[PDB]
Amino acid sequence: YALMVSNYLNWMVRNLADMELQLGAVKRIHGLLKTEAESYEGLLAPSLIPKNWPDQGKIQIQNLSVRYDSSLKPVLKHVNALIAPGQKIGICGRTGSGKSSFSLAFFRMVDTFEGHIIIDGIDIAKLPLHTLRSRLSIILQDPVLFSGTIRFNLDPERKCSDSTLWEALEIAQLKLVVKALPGGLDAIITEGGENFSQGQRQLFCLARAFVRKTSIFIMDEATASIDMATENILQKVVMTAFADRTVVTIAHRVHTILSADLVIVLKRGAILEFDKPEKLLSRKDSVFASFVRADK
Amino acid sequence: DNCCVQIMGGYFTWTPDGIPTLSNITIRIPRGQLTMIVGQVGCGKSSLLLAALGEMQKVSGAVFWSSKRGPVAYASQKPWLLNATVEENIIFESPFNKQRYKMVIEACSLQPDIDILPHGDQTQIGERGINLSGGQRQRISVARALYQHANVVFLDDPFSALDIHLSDHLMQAGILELLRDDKRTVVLVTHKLQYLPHADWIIAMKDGTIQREGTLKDFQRSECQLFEHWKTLMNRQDQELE
Ligand SMILES: Nc1ncnc2c1ncn2[C@@H]1O[C@H](COP(=O)(O)OP(=O)(O)OP(=O)(O)O)[C@@H](O)[C@H]1O
Ligand SMILES: Nc1ncnc2c1ncn2[C@@H]1O[C@H](COP(=O)(O)OP(=O)(O)O)[C@@H](O)[C@H]1O
Ligand SMILES: [Mg+2]
Ligand SMILES: [Mg+2]
Numbered sequence: 001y002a003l004m005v006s007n008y009l010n011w012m013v014r015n016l017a018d019m020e021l022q023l024g025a026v027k028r029i030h031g032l033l034k035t036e037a038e039s040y041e042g043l044l045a046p047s048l049i050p051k052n053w054p055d056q057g058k059i060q061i062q063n064l065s066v067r068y069d070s071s072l073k074p075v076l077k078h079v080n081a082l083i084a085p086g087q088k089i090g091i092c093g094r095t096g097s098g099k100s101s102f103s104l105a106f107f108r109m110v111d112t113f114e115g116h117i118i119i120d121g122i123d124i125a126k127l128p129l130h131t132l133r134s135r136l137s138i139i140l141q142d143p144v145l146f147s148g149t150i151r152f153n154l155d156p157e158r159k160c161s162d163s164t165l166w167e168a169l170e171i172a173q174l175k176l177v178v179k180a181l182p183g184g185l186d187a188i189i190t191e192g193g194e195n196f197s198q199g200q201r202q203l204f205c206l207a208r209a210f211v212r213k214t215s216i217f218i219m220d221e222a223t224a225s226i227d228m229a230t231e232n233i234l235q236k237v238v239m240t241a242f243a244d245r246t247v248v249t250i251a252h253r254v255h256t257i258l259s260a261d262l263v264i265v266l267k268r269g270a271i272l273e274f275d276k277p278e279k280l281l282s283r284k285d286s287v288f289a290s291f292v293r294a295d296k
Numbered sequence: 297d298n299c300c301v302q303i304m305g306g307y308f309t310w311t312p313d314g315i316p317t318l319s320n321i322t323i324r325i326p327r328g329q330l331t332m333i334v335g336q337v338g339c340g341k342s343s344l345l346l347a348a349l350g351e352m353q354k355v356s357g358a359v360f361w362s363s364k365r366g367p368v369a370y371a372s373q374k375p376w377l378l379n380a381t382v383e384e385n386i387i388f389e390s391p392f393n394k395q396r397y398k399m400v401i402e403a404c405s406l407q408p409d410i411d412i413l414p415h416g417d418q419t420q421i422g423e424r425g426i427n428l429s430g431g432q433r434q435r436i437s438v439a440r441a442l443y444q445h446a447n448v449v450f451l452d453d454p455f456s457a458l459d460i461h462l463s464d465h466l467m468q469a470g471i472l473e474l475l476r477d478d479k480r481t482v483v484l485v486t487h488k489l490q491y492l493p494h495a496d497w498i499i500a501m502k503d504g505t506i507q508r509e510g511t512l513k514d515f516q517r518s519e520c521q522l523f524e525h526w527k528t529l530m531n532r533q534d535q536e537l538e
């Protein structure tokens with residue numbers, strides 16, 4: 001057993017050494033196990049919510065100043081809107097003003113540290129968070145697509161027929177090139193969407209927003225990438241088809257949003273103007289009229 | 297003839313099997329001279345630049361580069377960024393000239409975005425580091441272009457994630473300001489069609505092939521229907537495009 005000591009002392013101390021090296025991974029996974037939650041259960045009870053929670057979108061904004069973090073400045077200032085259920089709202093502004101901050105204020109990711117904000121009477125912040133982000137709809141500037149297949153990338157919750165998916169390809173003007181793919185449906189979108197174009201990736205993300213049948217679609221700058229002819233054609237298609245739907249649009253180009261109902265202008269976190277586009281273009285001192293003039 | 301890129305009749309592809317991606321590309325790009333590529337969505341706009349690099353596969357056709365191939369500057373449709381500092385992004389293994397770096401970051405107008413960053417110039421951005429806006433990442437990725445003294449600039453679309461003010465600052469200063477100083481060959485894809493007066497040659501392409509190439513007066517005379525589509529589409533339909 002002295003020969004057992006001289007054959008097993010090295011495995012004692014070397015297994016102690018990589019035991020410390022492997023237990024550093026337990027220390028790292030327990031440090032990352034203790035992260036912050038988002039507190040997905042809300043304040044308000046889940047019995048006041050109907051089937052159609054956003055049936056008529058009365059988005060009343062009152063005094064909504066938001067913040068990304070606790071150490072930062074208030075990004076948006078004291079803003080006020082009264083948004084009708086049949087309305088279509090185009091929000092324009094500079095980069096760094098807060099217009100894509102304002103689209104995240106409907107979904108409770110950017111922290112609403114003061115503000116009243118409601119839809120259909122009842123408070124946004126007093127809601128279940130999953131029922132909030134399930135019955136509402138966004139579309140972002142970034143096209144993020146997953147791997148697998150196109151019927152999964154348009155419908156990951158598996159509950160749809162192919163006719164409403166091809167209706168979403170009809171209202172994306174995507175149906176002709178998805179029929180030009182050699183499966184018809186069910187071919188392969190790769191890691192991040194590298195099988196296709198950037199505008200086709202954004203068109204897939206647009207049609208993935210078009211599967212869901214909620215009465216609120218909000219729109220960030222999706223047609224920053226997709227060109228002007230399909231911007232006009234797709235703007236005409238989503239203005240004829242979604243007639244009931246309260247569409248909020250961060251338009252990238254101002255000449256597709258001259259046909260809007262009323263227009264928010266956001267400069268440095270605050271509403272400068274809120275009226276008709278003909279009224280704010282015809283005022284001629286307004287910064288919306290110089291946004292039209294500086295474009296064309 | 298003063299023409300660096302002379303791709304004639306290329307039947308290029310991505311996949312080695314199947315149909316080719318591109319077909320019969322008979323293009324010319326003049327030296328020292330800005331040109332623009334306008335097509336529809338998914339119709340070959342990045343694919344011409346990646347076939348001109350030879351990243352896409354040549355089934356048939358021939359490429360006639362002139363001063364092998366030199367170093368070209370390039371900024372993609374998706375902005376690739378290092379895990380380095382912002383100065384090490386924008387220099388990108390060049391000698392650091394302070395005044396040429398200064399007029400690049402004044403030309404891009406990234407100075408308030410470098411002013412709000414917590415170490416300013418030398419903040420280690422990237423994956424390991426601080427997340428960015430995406431528009432600032434687009435301006436950083438085109439700010440690594442137009443610096444290299446590389447004389448051919450393959451500038452794929454900068455004008456997705458930027459507004460009208462920063463794109464007129466990028467199109468009056470920078471593009472046609474310092475790229476008219478030396479004779480740098482700049483090619484652009486851009487759907488913001490107000491800069492179609494600021495183009496000497498114009499490539500218009502459609503579904504793999506090109507439709508035509510040439511100047512705005514040649515598209516005015518010979519093509520004259522997609523010229524009318526651009527005249528309706530830019531919404532300055534009263535004037536004459538020159
Ligand atoms: N990396 C790739 N691998 C395989 N096929 C591709 C790839 N990129 C594009 N394609 C195919 O080639 C065609 C050309 O797309 P491309 O990426 O050139 O679009 P684009 O016109 O440059 O996009 P945009 O409108 O954003 O400029 C598309 O129909 C697409 O299906
Ligand atoms: N992830 C973030 N963390 C902290 N601050 C941010 C973040 N994103 C944006 N901001 C700040 O919010 C302001 C408005 O940004 P944002 O709304 O995202 O862009 P835009 O105003 O172009 O729509 C910016 O000045 C920026 O400094
Ligand atoms: Mg934004
Ligand atoms: Mg492209």
